[PDB]
Amino acid sequence: GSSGSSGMEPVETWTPGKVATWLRGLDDSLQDYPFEDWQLPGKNLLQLCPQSLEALAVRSLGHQELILGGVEQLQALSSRLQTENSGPSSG
Numbered sequence: 001g002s003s004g005s006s007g008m009e010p011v012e013t014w015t016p017g018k019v020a021t022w023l024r025g026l027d028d029s030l031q032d033y034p035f036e037d038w039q040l041p042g043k044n045l046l047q048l049c050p051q052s053l054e055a056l057a058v059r060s061l062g063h064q065e066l067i068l069g070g071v072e073q074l075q076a077l078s079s080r081l082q083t084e085n086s087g088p089s090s091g
Contacts, residue, residue, distance in 0.1 A: 010078035014042030046075050
């Protein structure tokens with residue numbers, strides 16, 4: 001099925017077609033990289049590394065820090081503690 005911007009699903013589940021949107025937004029310096037081609041799934045987006053990115057023509061550090069940095073925040077919101085049953089309440 002398809003959800004309508006309802007709920008904050010984990011990135012580890014996100015599809016390799018949405019990431020491109022989350023990557024292009026991060027910054028323009030990255031908007032250049034062929035995301036639509038990267039076809040990289042979320043499960044891999046949260047398990048990325050400075051040794052792999054290189055393969056995608058991402059050797060430069062500055063660019064790595066930009067992404068890797070934001071990913072660190074995702075791994076958190078994505079990796080929850082038995083949220084299925086009960087999770088944190090923001091209020």
